[PDB]
Amino acid sequence: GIDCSFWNESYLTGSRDERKKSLLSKFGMDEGVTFMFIGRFDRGQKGVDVLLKAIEILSSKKEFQEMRFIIIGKGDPELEGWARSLEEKHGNVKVITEMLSREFVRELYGSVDFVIIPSYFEPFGLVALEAMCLGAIPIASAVGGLRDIITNETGILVKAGDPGELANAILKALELSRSDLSKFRENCKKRAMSFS
């Protein structure tokens, strides 16, 4: 079950636009549509590999410049090395290889546009609900609990393990109007609150 006493936007200062601008400026980036990943870096569970492949696919496109990526998690030295390499290659990629407190995570969810949950294995998907409670729009693998939580009114579902499909979904998400973004956020919070 989700703790909506902790996971809500009451704890956050100012507006979403303000927070996102400040956040990105700390990473040396100007404003852009911001996608975040938070999870273990492994080969077949959380899907960081799928995300990194998707970033590589997108990087040859002009629209890539309008995207910002925040990639948080730890694990394999090879996977961390890969994430770090992309960070050095692309000025719109930030990688943070460590655990952050739930307070920090909460602030981040309330300060990005989308949270990417490219899981292969996700029995509970409590992460989707937490992100949704804070107005972050999920782009997620259609697996386990994520299937139950995420709807067409609240986010984007993709086939697990498919970097191409993910890249397509990210481009689709980038193109959404502010009005559509706003409706998604409203539905996200409503749905997350309904999970009580």
PDB file of all heavy atoms in Angstrom, residues 183-195:
ATOM      1  N   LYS A 183      -3.273  17.350 -17.686  1.00  0.00           N
ATOM      2  CA  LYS A 183      -4.338  16.353 -17.516  1.00  0.00           C
ATOM      3  C   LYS A 183      -3.779  15.020 -17.014  1.00  0.00           C
ATOM      4  O   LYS A 183      -4.334  14.428 -16.086  1.00  0.00           O
ATOM      5  CB  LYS A 183      -5.145  16.182 -18.802  1.00  0.00           C
ATOM      6  CG  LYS A 183      -6.084  17.335 -19.047  1.00  0.00           C
ATOM      7  CD  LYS A 183      -6.653  17.323 -20.446  1.00  0.00           C
ATOM      8  CE  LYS A 183      -7.347  18.641 -20.755  1.00  0.00           C
ATOM      9  NZ  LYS A 183      -7.933  18.619 -22.127  1.00  0.00           N
ATOM     10  N   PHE A 184      -2.659  14.583 -17.598  1.00  0.00           N
ATOM     11  CA  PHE A 184      -1.973  13.374 -17.140  1.00  0.00           C
ATOM     12  C   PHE A 184      -1.637  13.453 -15.650  1.00  0.00           C
ATOM     13  O   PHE A 184      -1.925  12.517 -14.905  1.00  0.00           O
ATOM     14  CB  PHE A 184      -0.702  13.100 -17.961  1.00  0.00           C
ATOM     15  CG  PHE A 184      -0.924  12.235 -19.186  1.00  0.00           C
ATOM     16  CD1 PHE A 184      -0.540  12.685 -20.451  1.00  0.00           C
ATOM     17  CD2 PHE A 184      -1.497  10.966 -19.073  1.00  0.00           C
ATOM     18  CE1 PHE A 184      -0.727  11.887 -21.590  1.00  0.00           C
ATOM     19  CE2 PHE A 184      -1.702  10.164 -20.199  1.00  0.00           C
ATOM     20  CZ  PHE A 184      -1.315  10.624 -21.466  1.00  0.00           C
ATOM     21  N   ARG A 185      -1.051  14.576 -15.222  1.00  0.00           N
ATOM     22  CA  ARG A 185      -0.666  14.775 -13.813  1.00  0.00           C
ATOM     23  C   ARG A 185      -1.870  14.703 -12.875  1.00  0.00           C
ATOM     24  O   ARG A 185      -1.811  14.065 -11.820  1.00  0.00           O
ATOM     25  CB  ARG A 185       0.056  16.114 -13.614  1.00  0.00           C
ATOM     26  CG  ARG A 185       1.355  16.226 -14.392  1.00  0.00           C
ATOM     27  CD  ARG A 185       2.272  17.308 -13.849  1.00  0.00           C
ATOM     28  NE  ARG A 185       3.149  17.807 -14.904  1.00  0.00           N
ATOM     29  CZ  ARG A 185       4.190  17.154 -15.414  1.00  0.00           C
ATOM     30  NH1 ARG A 185       4.549  15.946 -14.960  1.00  0.00           N
ATOM     31  NH2 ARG A 185       4.888  17.723 -16.386  1.00  0.00           N
ATOM     32  N   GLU A 186      -2.951  15.373 -13.264  1.00  0.00           N
ATOM     33  CA  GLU A 186      -4.206  15.340 -12.519  1.00  0.00           C
ATOM     34  C   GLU A 186      -4.717  13.905 -12.347  1.00  0.00           C
ATOM     35  O   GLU A 186      -5.054  13.487 -11.237  1.00  0.00           O
ATOM     36  CB  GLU A 186      -5.249  16.198 -13.239  1.00  0.00           C
ATOM     37  CG  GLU A 186      -6.639  16.141 -12.637  1.00  0.00           C
ATOM     38  CD  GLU A 186      -6.892  17.279 -11.691  1.00  0.00           C
ATOM     39  OE1 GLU A 186      -6.397  17.224 -10.542  1.00  0.00           O
ATOM     40  OE2 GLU A 186      -7.581  18.237 -12.105  1.00  0.00           O
ATOM     41  N   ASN A 187      -4.761  13.158 -13.451  1.00  0.00           N
ATOM     42  CA  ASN A 187      -5.209  11.760 -13.426  1.00  0.00           C
ATOM     43  C   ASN A 187      -4.286  10.872 -12.597  1.00  0.00           C
ATOM     44  O   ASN A 187      -4.748   9.987 -11.872  1.00  0.00           O
ATOM     45  CB  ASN A 187      -5.345  11.211 -14.847  1.00  0.00           C
ATOM     46  CG  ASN A 187      -6.428  11.917 -15.656  1.00  0.00           C
ATOM     47  OD1 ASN A 187      -7.327  12.551 -15.102  1.00  0.00           O
ATOM     48  ND2 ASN A 187      -6.353  11.792 -16.972  1.00  0.00           N
ATOM     49  N   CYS A 188      -2.982  11.120 -12.706  1.00  0.00           N
ATOM     50  CA  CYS A 188      -1.982  10.385 -11.930  1.00  0.00           C
ATOM     51  C   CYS A 188      -2.232  10.497 -10.428  1.00  0.00           C
ATOM     52  O   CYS A 188      -2.319   9.482  -9.732  1.00  0.00           O
ATOM     53  CB  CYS A 188      -0.572  10.865 -12.281  1.00  0.00           C
ATOM     54  SG  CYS A 188       0.076  10.098 -13.760  1.00  0.00           S
ATOM     55  N   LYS A 189      -2.359  11.730  -9.946  1.00  0.00           N
ATOM     56  CA  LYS A 189      -2.616  11.994  -8.528  1.00  0.00           C
ATOM     57  C   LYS A 189      -3.933  11.394  -8.058  1.00  0.00           C
ATOM     58  O   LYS A 189      -3.982  10.777  -6.998  1.00  0.00           O
ATOM     59  CB  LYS A 189      -2.602  13.492  -8.242  1.00  0.00           C
ATOM     60  CG  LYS A 189      -1.245  14.143  -8.440  1.00  0.00           C
ATOM     61  CD  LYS A 189      -1.357  15.633  -8.214  1.00  0.00           C
ATOM     62  CE  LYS A 189      -0.426  16.391  -9.136  1.00  0.00           C
ATOM     63  NZ  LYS A 189      -0.612  17.871  -8.983  1.00  0.00           N
ATOM     64  N   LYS A 190      -4.987  11.576  -8.851  1.00  0.00           N
ATOM     65  CA  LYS A 190      -6.294  10.971  -8.582  1.00  0.00           C
ATOM     66  C   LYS A 190      -6.198   9.457  -8.420  1.00  0.00           C
ATOM     67  O   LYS A 190      -6.690   8.893  -7.432  1.00  0.00           O
ATOM     68  CB  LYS A 190      -7.270  11.288  -9.719  1.00  0.00           C
ATOM     69  CG  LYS A 190      -7.925  12.640  -9.645  1.00  0.00           C
ATOM     70  CD  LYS A 190      -9.129  12.677 -10.578  1.00  0.00           C
ATOM     71  CE  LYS A 190      -9.615  14.100 -10.815  1.00  0.00           C
ATOM     72  NZ  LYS A 190     -10.516  14.145 -12.000  1.00  0.00           N
ATOM     73  N   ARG A 191      -5.560   8.805  -9.394  1.00  0.00           N
ATOM     74  CA  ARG A 191      -5.446   7.349  -9.397  1.00  0.00           C
ATOM     75  C   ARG A 191      -4.608   6.843  -8.229  1.00  0.00           C
ATOM     76  O   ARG A 191      -4.985   5.871  -7.561  1.00  0.00           O
ATOM     77  CB  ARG A 191      -4.900   6.835 -10.735  1.00  0.00           C
ATOM     78  CG  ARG A 191      -4.589   5.346 -10.726  1.00  0.00           C
ATOM     79  CD  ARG A 191      -4.877   4.683 -12.053  1.00  0.00           C
ATOM     80  NE  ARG A 191      -4.849   3.226 -11.911  1.00  0.00           N
ATOM     81  CZ  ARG A 191      -5.907   2.470 -11.625  1.00  0.00           C
ATOM     82  NH1 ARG A 191      -7.100   3.023 -11.442  1.00  0.00           N
ATOM     83  NH2 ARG A 191      -5.769   1.155 -11.520  1.00  0.00           N
ATOM     84  N   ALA A 192      -3.474   7.506  -7.991  1.00  0.00           N
ATOM     85  CA  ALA A 192      -2.583   7.171  -6.878  1.00  0.00           C
ATOM     86  C   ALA A 192      -3.265   7.334  -5.516  1.00  0.00           C
ATOM     87  O   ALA A 192      -3.036   6.530  -4.608  1.00  0.00           O
ATOM     88  CB  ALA A 192      -1.307   8.004  -6.946  1.00  0.00           C
ATOM     89  N   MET A 193      -4.092   8.370  -5.393  1.00  0.00           N
ATOM     90  CA  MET A 193      -4.876   8.628  -4.186  1.00  0.00           C
ATOM     91  C   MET A 193      -5.949   7.554  -3.993  1.00  0.00           C
ATOM     92  O   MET A 193      -6.268   7.185  -2.862  1.00  0.00           O
ATOM     93  CB  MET A 193      -5.527  10.012  -4.270  1.00  0.00           C
ATOM     94  CG  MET A 193      -6.023  10.574  -2.946  1.00  0.00           C
ATOM     95  SD  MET A 193      -6.866  12.162  -3.127  1.00  0.00           S
ATOM     96  CE  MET A 193      -5.505  13.249  -3.562  1.00  0.00           C
ATOM     97  N   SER A 194      -6.491   7.057  -5.105  1.00  0.00           N
ATOM     98  CA  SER A 194      -7.520   6.002  -5.091  1.00  0.00           C
ATOM     99  C   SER A 194      -6.970   4.650  -4.622  1.00  0.00           C
ATOM    100  O   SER A 194      -7.730   3.793  -4.168  1.00  0.00           O
ATOM    101  CB  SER A 194      -8.185   5.860  -6.468  1.00  0.00           C
ATOM    102  OG  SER A 194      -7.509   4.920  -7.295  1.00  0.00           O
ATOM    103  N   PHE A 195      -5.654   4.465  -4.740  1.00  0.00           N
ATOM    104  CA  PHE A 195      -4.984   3.283  -4.190  1.00  0.00           C
ATOM    105  C   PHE A 195      -4.783   3.410  -2.674  1.00  0.00           C
ATOM    106  O   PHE A 195      -4.251   2.501  -2.029  1.00  0.00           O
ATOM    107  CB  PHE A 195      -3.655   3.013  -4.911  1.00  0.00           C
ATOM    108  CG  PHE A 195      -3.787   2.123  -6.120  1.00  0.00           C
ATOM    109  CD1 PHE A 195      -4.265   2.626  -7.324  1.00  0.00           C
ATOM    110  CD2 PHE A 195      -3.421   0.779  -6.052  1.00  0.00           C
ATOM    111  CE1 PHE A 195      -4.387   1.803  -8.443  1.00  0.00           C
ATOM    112  CE2 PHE A 195      -3.538  -0.054  -7.166  1.00  0.00           C
ATOM    113  CZ  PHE A 195      -4.022   0.459  -8.364  1.00  0.00           C
TER     114      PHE A 195
END
